[PDB]
């Protein structure tokens, strides 16, 4: 938003800042049925026993489904792959 001052201008900038982060464990891809799955948009994350997929700027876990993943590859090339079940 702008404002006027003698011989000049003043700007009020409204911005967004994150807060209250938390540790998590991550993997690059998920192996299942001999196929590799990558996230369409987001990052894989683990709470200790189960795996979810979440957007990268706000914690909102979701169940891993073929809706929000694409296969495009195999299970024997990526480094650090972790195998788990993928629903439908």
């Amino acid at each position: 938003f702008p404002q006027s001052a003698p011989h000049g201008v003043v700007f009020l900038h409204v911005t967004y800042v994150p807060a209250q982060e938390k540790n998590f464990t991550t993997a690059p891809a998920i192996c299942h049925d001999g196929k590799a799955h990558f996230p369409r948009e987001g990052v894989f994350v683990s709470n200790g026993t189960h795996w979810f997929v979440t957007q990268r700027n706000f914690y909102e876990p979701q169940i891993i489904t073929t809706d929000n993943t694409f296969v495009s590859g195999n299970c024997d090339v990526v480094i650090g792959i972790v195998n788990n079940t993928v629903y439908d």
Binding site: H7, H13, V14, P18, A19
Partner: protein, 49 residues
């Protein structure tokens, strides 16, 4: 020192809305000068030189 490791990530769970200010000059004063009155005053002989 941030705790780097090749299988760990951090993700924010809350946000904040912040407002800041920035100040910028734009224009300055407009002046004008008359030579003869400043230099020579009313001296008639001075203007000839």
């Amino acid at each position: 020192s941030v705790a780097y490791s090749n299988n760990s990530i951090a993700i924010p769970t809350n946000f904040t809305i912040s407002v800041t200010t920035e100040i910028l000059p734009v224009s300055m004063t407009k002046t004008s000068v008359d030579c003869t009155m400043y230099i020579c005053g009313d001296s008639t002989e001075c203007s000839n030189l």
